[PDB]
Structure formats: structure tokens, C-alpha cells
């Protein structure tokens, strides 16, 4: 269903498969904000390593739910960004500050547990 | 006449309550907030809008005055935004998850820790 | 219309504000207060009716409701009464003056100390 | 296709959504042993909390991969078993011991911080 | 003429009784930096507790004497902002970062001696 | 206004502009006393540094208000008397014991920090 | 002009850029971002000390000093020239020489040079 | 004619005194010190324009090149602007009131203290 | 062109060779020794991890392993290939890769990077 | 219109940087220097004539002022004379080689030391 199971240690580990469109990301937007309240989380970890190409209008929604998930009290992290998709994040109107990208899911939870509790 | 929105006055973090009042004519939640901010002092305060569906098109009375109250109230914070409410995105302010872990970090900003 | 009344939920000793409603259909705050008393596990709560003037002839819906919470979970207390409200008493219960010193002894009965 | 990304802290977290049939499970069984062949871990967590229906042909195959990946060197721990599937396991001649079935994914890795790191 | 200034030792507790026009305010603004450089100043405490209303011909000056006096070599605080005068800044293009507001003239020194000295 | 707005850290700090009349100084004694009624402070600091002339009629009021606010319950210092006014003030035959006149405003509050709150 | 550069003490990597008299080249970026995650270098430098100058569009060169912020961490332009920084039609971190940048490159993961 | 301003070098802090020169034609002073910042290792750079009255046309050699030393080596700082120069400035950066306390904080950036 | 970059951290002087293995380019030696004593010279590196292959003359590449002991501290050969070391009928300290040859280069002049 | 010299304070002493050479007619480097010693209180000062070639007929002011600041307050010194300059010797004082060591021994004369 593209939105995998995520609860771990009062943090969330939501992976992403190969996407289809931003109308699939519409489903991805509702099924992240709903889970972050009922499971009272503190930080969402996103693994976009599976994708290798992303539409420019998609990244102004996946990049925009960063602003939504920060407002519900979750300093999210975007682990494992590929090179070719990052060349679609240069001609974008970048204001990517406070997003806290990382390298892998190993180092991703190492940085998030620094900003919470441990 | 329903001459109330809500306003409480506890110890120095003086928080607030907001029900479903999603209309621009409720500008009364501003002067009732401003006049108490020099009645007693308040080094931090919360809002607790956990029940509101939904802000129509006007955060310019909600999130605009949050920096127009930094001038007096020293860093207001939102408590418990709903799921569908943050779908409103025209375009910051400290926020949190809920009151029981929003009050504690609002006690951290005033030299008070919970000790048993 | 005005069937909304009030609720809030801080750290584990909760409270419940009461604004002005001097009516006889006030059975909602007799009911909707006790609903959250076991929807969440709150040990001791408050009433906080420091702005409520006045009651007509019914403490039976206002002080016998302060005996259900004695047997639901634990010992609600009245936070502040106006002098002309309690000025007539042809009628016990722990009470306090203001919220900033009522919430102090709330933590004493539930083993917390706010010092640094 | 429905087989999520898993690497974390020299452990593993595969998950299973409502992808029931053994037209996927034979494909899924290769997707686990080859993945644990790549990243050498010691505890593989199979979170199956989502699905409620399992056919008797799947129960052997899901009961086989726990015996397969045990031989590879990973103590597979099955967290989040529904009460509907736990009814219909005993109709198969199960011998489900040594699988260490925890409660859920929160309670899983704290039991899997016992093998590694201790 | 009207608006005085007075020193306390590495401080400046200026006051404002009542404001009429920019011609008084520029005379006030020219009195400020002339009294900055004559002594050695470290922090200016502006008291504005006695102003009923304001307009953008006046508030643009008081919204920029922060930006003037910071460049001259001293921090500044704006203590005692009234409720009705603060809501008349909503038309302005907010750049009020580091203005370091306070509540009354006592708490001005509480948030200034923290920045400087014991 | 002529009179200032005045409040500073369990004391007071009243300034005085350039003035010449005893139609200002009659209400000015009430403008100082009405604050020390509501504000319970154990000492004021009158500063007369800006004045260059005080007549023998007006010198009665500043020769009174030191003894007046002592009877209210606060010590009174007088800071920064100019040499021109300090000569002609003696022709009003004083009995000044309890004046505690400092030299400038910076060393003024160091005296009331010695009196109040040792 | 076959292949550009790399070097790697493996918590950081860093490469040198010699003088390139063109602006059409982009393989100082794609051959960099591919190897940026094939070995996990946290910090990286640019070391473009002997390069005078680049003027046509170095917006590629200063936004490839933005991709590693969102890929791993902390690019730093080691030793830009005096004339080259005069061209500015457009935050980040930087330094002066190759070793005094390295002293604050390891100071972002707290393993300083000892003894 | 006599276009020869100044350059000194006291310590690992290196400053560049600027005397009175109210003219636009100084394209030298932004390149006669960036030639120095790589010549010897200029960590922090003062400018000390306490005598320069006045200027109206150019901030581009006063605050745009202030970003150059921030990216050449580090942390330029203006020292003691006059009153009429900042009487209005409708055109951030770090400044100090006078020179003897500019060096008091410039040595803190290179982690040293003068005490005996 | 003439790109034979040095890129030194200046307490050691390591150096990167990209693939250009022909005899007429002596500038891996002549345009190294001049820049060797251009700064104060201690232990240096070669890092021929991308070079396939040395054709018939490593005498240029091995006398330069002895034209450095005369002028400075020890050179080392970092990361040779497998078939490159096939038949050498013609010694000098060496290592496996840059992440550990640089560490033991600091362990010849007694410095280390610990946490 | 180019009568300009520069002096300010590294917390006690006074640097005095002078550019390309003065002739005998410009004696104002002397008289605009003793004014500064009783404008601000100075003890040590550095004559800092490091880039200046040359002086041909005026040591009878440049080294005769070397007894003036000793008589005015204290301890003048010259910083870094050129090798070309001091070949003229027809005829003491304290000198040094450059400012990075001239200041370091000038702080000892005012009893202060750079630590850490």
C-alpha cells in the first residue's frame, strides 16, 4: 500500500517504495499526519533511497509536508537522498533550512536520538 | 450574549483554551489576550487549540499576532494542532505535541524543572 | 449553540475551567467533566470558577458533583469563590484562593515539587 | 514491489502489509535471504501486525523462512501477531518454538538489544 | 527639549513621556546617537509605557532605532510596549529579530545584565 | 511633560529637565508623592543636573521634598547639583542633614544599594 | 583532460580543482555526487586555491556547495582567490588554507589532532 | 596623486586603519586588503573608520565587501561608525563602539586573553 | 594540460595521480621536487590507485622514490593494482590505501587523531 | 589636503603607522603626535615606519622626537627600520624587527602578557 509500518521507540521509520505521482503522495500526506497524533511521535524518519526520479511538482509537496510535520512537533529527517533526484532539488526555489538531512537509516536515528532524550 | 472565548490565569505560564470558533468575527481573542499580558506578566504562554475545525483563510489573526505578542509575552507557543488543520498552508513559532509535554518545555524556559 | 462548555488537560493533575453560565440546564458540566475523569486517568482536578457569578439556588448540582469525583477517582477542589457568591449559605470540601497556589497543593497531594 | 527497506544498526526490520498470496511469498522469501546475505545482521524483525488473513499454504512458507534465516545466522523474531492468524496456526502441525514471538515492534528491538550488544 | 537621557554606568535608561510628530522624534533620534558617542554606551533601555497610539510616520523611526543603535555599537531593548500600540505594527514588514523586548523598566535590566556583566 | 515616568528595581529614578517656575514645582511634589504611594519604594533619586538656576522661592520646595518623602517612608538623595545653583541655595539657610547628595547618577544608586538591601 | 580528482582519508573526502578554462563542464559535480555516497564522507572540501578565475556561471559551483548539505554535510571552499571573490552577484562555511581548514573540518565531528 | 591609505599587522588579528577619504573613486581599498588577507593569514579584520565624515553614495565597498572577508578567511568588523553616517541608513555585520574594545573581543575569536 | 596537482596539508605533502602514464611527462617528478621544497618537506605520498598501467618505465617512478629521501622524509607508494605488480625485475615503504597510509605517515613523526 | 596621520589605542599603547616618505617640510607627523599623548593618556607607542624609503636629512627630528615622548610620558620605540634606510649613519633608543614581536615586548613594559 506504499505506506509501511513505522512505530519504533517513540520515533517513526516510514519508508517509501517507487512512487507513482503526487496523487499517490496525497495518500502519503494524510497517512503521515494522522499517525503522528494517534501515535504521539517526536520525529519522523523518511527513507527516499528507493526512488531515483521525482517530478518537480512532487517535491513541493514532499518538501512541504516537512513544514506540516514540523508544526505538529516533529523535527523530521530525510535520510538517503540519491544524486539524480538532488539535481531536481537545485533548480527548485530552495529554502531548505532546518530539514536535517542524513546519509543512511543507521546514522539517521543516531542524529534524531541526539535531538530527543538520549 | 456569548461574551467569552476562554482565558485562564494560572502560575506564570498563563495558557488559554479555544473551542471551535472558526470565524473572522472572533477578533475578541486579541484584546482579551493583550490586556491580560500586562495585567499579570507572563514569561511564556500556550494556546491549546486542540479542538478547532478549521481555520478558513485567516491565520493573519492567529499566527501573525504570535510575533505581535513576542513584543510583550516572550515567545508564545502553539499546543496540539489538529491533523487536517495544518493542511492550511499560505506560507517561525515554537510548537509542541500536547499540553503534558508542552507545559514541561514551557517550564524549562522559566527555570523550573519537575522534581519528585 | 452554546453547548460546548469547557475542558482542558495539563500534566496529570488536570483542571477544568468554568466560565459564566448561571443556568439550570448546567447538567452538562455535571456530566462532561466526569467523562474525561476516566477517558484519561486524572487523579485530582479543579473547578476554577473564579469568574462565575452567581448560582441561583442549586449547590446540589455544584457541590454534590464534588462528591462523585471523590468516588470516581480523587478529591476535586474549588478554586476561588467570589465573596457575594458564597455570601449566602443556608447549607467539608477542600478549597483554595487562586490557581497559582491551588496548583501548588495539587502537586503535594500527587507527589510533585516544582523547584529549581 | 511491496518489500520495504530495512537496514538499521546491524539489525533488520522487514514489514508485511496486506500482500497475502504465495505468488508474492515465494518472491518475498528470496527477498529476505538475499538481503540478509548483503548486510550481515543478527536479528531480523518481521512485523506482520497489518494482515489478518493467512492461508494454510502461506503458514508453512512463513513458518519456513524463520527456519531458513535461522540457518543463515539471524534469530528471526516475529512481532505483532494478530489473534485471527494465531487461531489458525495450530490447525497446521506447528512446532513454533525458538522464534521468540514478541508483542510489537516497540517491544521487539529491546528484546533484540539483548542478543547484540550484550 | 522634552525627552531626556540619563546614564547608569555602561547603560542608558532613556524614557519617552509623550510623542507628537517626527520633528520631535528626529530631534529625539538625533539626541540618542549624539549621547551614544559622547559617552561609552553598551546597552540602551527604551521606555515607551506612555504612548496611546502611533502611525507609520512615527513607528518607522522607532522600528529602526534598533537598526540605528545596533550599528553604532550597543544593544538595545524596547521595554513596556502597550497593547494598543503593538497591534498597530501589523502593517509593518516584520524584521524585529533581536529587538529583545521586555515587559517593564525593571525587567529591561534583567535581560540586559544577562548579556553583559554580573 | 516636565515630570518623568519613573520606576527602577525596588527604587525610583526621577529626572528633572530645565525649568524656571514654581507653578510646575507645586504639582511636581504631588507628581512625585502620588507615585510613591502606589509604588512602594524605599528611596528616590532626584537629579537636578540639567538646571542652571533655581530661585529662593523654588528652593523651598526642593528644600522640602527631601524632608517630605522621608516622612512618607523613603530616603531621598539629590544627585548632580551644579556649582551655580549650589552657591545660591545656601542663601536659603539650610539645615541639610539627611540629604546624602552623590556626585553623579552612576554613583547615586551605589549609595542606595548600600542603604537599602545590604 | 580525462578525469578530474578525488582523495579520501575516509571520514572526510576532499578533491582539488585545477584551472578549468570553460563553463560547459558539469562532471566536477556528477562524478562528485556519485562518489559522495559510495563512500560515506561526512565533511568535504573543494581546495580550489590555484584557480583564477571562474566568472560565467559558478552558480553551479556554489549550488554543488549546497547539494552536500542535503546529502551528507558541510562543504567548505578552501582558499578562494582575492580577485575571484570580487565577483559576487550572489549560509556556508569556508576557510583560508588546506590545513587550517582541516583543523576545523575534524572539529565538526570532534576528533582533533593530538600531540 | 597620493592614493596610499594604510596597512598594519599587529598580531594574528590584522587590521587596516582607514583615515578620512570621502570619495567614490577608491576601488583600491577593497583590493588593497584582499591582497593582504591571503598574503599573511588575516583571521579577523578591523577597519576602524572612527574619522570618516561622511558618505552617502557607497555601502558597496563598506558592507558588500564585508561579505568577502567572511568568505575569504573570516569575520570582518567595522569599528566605531560616526553619528551622521548612521543618522539615517536606508540601505547582519558585527561592530564595536571603539578600538580598544574591538581588540578585546577580536582576541576572543582566536581564543586568547590578555591578563596579568 | 599540465595538471599534476599537489594539494598538500603541508605538514605532510600527499599528492594525487590521475591516469596519464607516459614517459614524456616527467612533471610528476620535475614539477614535484620544485614544489617539494617550496614548503618545508616531511613525509609524502603518491596514491597511484587509478593508473593502469605502468608501461615499461617505472625507473622514473622509482628513482623519484629515492629522489625524495635526499631532499625530505620518506615517500610511500599508496595503493598499487594487482596486475601492476606483475613482474618487477628492478625497497621502499608502502601501504594499501589513503585512509591508513596517511595515519602511519603521522606515526613516523608522532602525531595522531584520536577522539 | 593630504595632511593625515593615524593613531589609536590597543588598550594602553598607540600604534603610529606612516606610509611613503616624508620630506623635511612635513614636520606635522611630530606635532600631531604629542597632542594625542595628552588627549588620551598614553604610555607606550610604536613608531611603525616599516614601509618607508627613505630619510636623507631628517634624523634631527625623527630621532630627536625620541626624547620627546620619553619627556612627555614614556617609552617611544621604532618598529622595523628598512635595511636600505639605516645605511645613513652619521650618529640609545629601543627598537624591534616587526609589529608581531614589537607589540609582544611592548606589553611587558606596561606589565601585561598574552596567555592561552
Short mmCIF file of N, CA and C in Angstrom, two decimals, chain H residues 2 4-11 15 17 19-20 99-100 103 111-116, chain J residues 2 4 6-9 11 15 17 19-20 48 99-100 103 107 111-116:
data_model
loop_
_atom_site.label_atom_id
_atom_site.label_comp_id
_atom_site.label_asym_id
_atom_site.label_seq_id
_atom_site.Cartn_x
_atom_site.Cartn_y
_atom_site.Cartn_z
N UNK H 2 48.23 61.01 -4.48
CA UNK H 2 48.68 60.48 -3.19
C UNK H 2 47.73 59.40 -2.69
N UNK H 4 47.50 56.44 -1.25
CA UNK H 4 48.24 55.47 -0.43
C UNK H 4 47.64 55.54 0.97
N UNK H 5 46.73 54.62 1.30
CA UNK H 5 45.95 54.81 2.52
C UNK H 5 46.70 54.33 3.77
N UNK H 6 46.76 53.00 3.98
CA UNK H 6 47.32 52.39 5.19
C UNK H 6 47.27 50.87 5.11
N UNK H 7 48.19 50.19 5.79
CA UNK H 7 48.04 48.79 6.21
C UNK H 7 49.02 48.51 7.33
N UNK H 8 48.53 48.00 8.45
CA UNK H 8 49.37 47.49 9.53
C UNK H 8 49.12 46.00 9.71
N UNK H 9 49.80 45.41 10.70
CA UNK H 9 49.68 43.98 11.01
C UNK H 9 50.18 43.69 12.42
N UNK H 10 49.36 43.91 13.46
CA UNK H 10 49.88 43.77 14.83
C UNK H 10 50.09 42.33 15.28
N UNK H 11 49.15 41.44 14.98
CA UNK H 11 49.17 40.09 15.54
C UNK H 11 48.56 39.16 14.50
N UNK H 15 44.51 44.42 11.30
CA UNK H 15 43.55 45.47 11.00
C UNK H 15 44.08 46.35 9.87
N UNK H 17 43.61 50.44 9.22
CA UNK H 17 43.10 51.76 9.57
C UNK H 17 42.69 52.53 8.32
N UNK H 19 41.62 56.35 7.30
CA UNK H 19 41.51 57.75 7.69
C UNK H 19 40.38 58.40 6.90
N UNK H 20 40.32 59.73 6.90
CA UNK H 20 39.28 60.43 6.17
C UNK H 20 39.56 60.37 4.67
N UNK H 99 37.96 51.29 19.45
CA UNK H 99 39.00 50.37 19.01
C UNK H 99 39.55 49.53 20.16
N UNK H 100 39.68 50.11 21.35
CA UNK H 100 40.28 49.39 22.47
C UNK H 100 39.37 48.29 23.01
N UNK H 103 39.49 45.16 19.89
CA UNK H 103 40.52 44.15 20.12
C UNK H 103 40.20 43.27 21.31
N UNK H 111 40.70 32.86 20.53
CA UNK H 111 40.84 32.16 21.81
C UNK H 111 42.11 32.58 22.56
N UNK H 112 42.16 33.85 22.93
CA UNK H 112 43.25 34.37 23.75
C UNK H 112 42.71 35.48 24.64
N UNK H 113 43.39 35.67 25.77
CA UNK H 113 43.03 36.69 26.75
C UNK H 113 44.29 37.37 27.25
N UNK H 114 44.25 38.69 27.39
CA UNK H 114 45.36 39.47 27.93
C UNK H 114 45.08 39.69 29.41
N UNK H 115 45.76 38.93 30.27
CA UNK H 115 45.61 39.04 31.72
C UNK H 115 46.98 38.93 32.37
N UNK H 116 47.25 39.83 33.32
CA UNK H 116 48.40 39.73 34.21
C UNK H 116 48.12 40.49 35.49
N UNK J 2 46.22 66.46 1.98
CA UNK J 2 46.66 65.12 2.35
C UNK J 2 47.41 65.13 3.67
N UNK J 4 47.38 63.99 6.73
CA UNK J 4 46.69 62.96 7.50
C UNK J 4 47.69 61.96 8.06
N UNK J 6 47.59 58.77 11.47
CA UNK J 6 46.62 57.90 12.13
C UNK J 6 47.18 57.36 13.44
N UNK J 7 46.38 57.43 14.49
CA UNK J 7 46.75 56.96 15.82
C UNK J 7 45.50 56.52 16.56
N UNK J 8 45.55 55.35 17.19
CA UNK J 8 44.50 54.89 18.10
C UNK J 8 45.13 53.88 19.06
N UNK J 9 44.30 53.24 19.88
CA UNK J 9 44.79 52.58 21.09
C UNK J 9 44.51 51.09 21.16
N UNK J 11 44.59 49.31 23.73
CA UNK J 11 44.15 49.28 25.13
C UNK J 11 45.04 49.91 26.20
N UNK J 15 49.56 52.69 18.33
CA UNK J 15 50.23 52.45 17.05
C UNK J 15 50.32 53.75 16.27
N UNK J 17 51.23 54.30 12.35
CA UNK J 17 51.66 53.79 11.06
C UNK J 17 51.85 54.96 10.10
N UNK J 19 53.12 55.96 6.06
CA UNK J 19 53.30 55.46 4.71
C UNK J 19 54.55 56.10 4.10
N UNK J 20 54.63 56.11 2.76
CA UNK J 20 55.78 56.50 1.93
C UNK J 20 56.27 57.91 2.30
N UNK J 48 56.42 52.43 14.00
CA UNK J 48 55.85 51.61 12.92
C UNK J 48 56.10 52.16 11.51
N UNK J 99 56.01 44.27 13.88
CA UNK J 99 54.96 44.58 14.84
C UNK J 99 54.51 43.35 15.63
N UNK J 100 54.66 42.15 15.06
CA UNK J 100 54.20 40.96 15.76
C UNK J 100 55.11 40.57 16.91
N UNK J 103 55.07 44.55 19.44
CA UNK J 103 53.98 44.68 20.40
C UNK J 103 54.14 43.70 21.55
N UNK J 107 54.11 45.02 25.49
CA UNK J 107 53.18 44.70 26.56
C UNK J 107 53.88 44.40 27.87
N UNK J 111 53.41 45.83 31.68
CA UNK J 111 53.18 44.75 32.65
C UNK J 111 51.92 43.94 32.35
N UNK J 112 51.78 43.52 31.09
CA UNK J 112 50.70 42.63 30.68
C UNK J 112 51.24 41.58 29.72
N UNK J 113 50.58 40.43 29.68
CA UNK J 113 51.06 39.28 28.93
C UNK J 113 49.89 38.56 28.27
N UNK J 114 50.12 38.06 27.06
CA UNK J 114 49.12 37.28 26.32
C UNK J 114 49.24 35.82 26.74
N UNK J 115 48.13 35.24 27.18
CA UNK J 115 48.11 33.87 27.68
C UNK J 115 47.16 33.06 26.80
N UNK J 116 47.32 31.74 26.86
CA UNK J 116 46.44 30.74 26.25
C UNK J 116 46.31 30.87 24.73
#
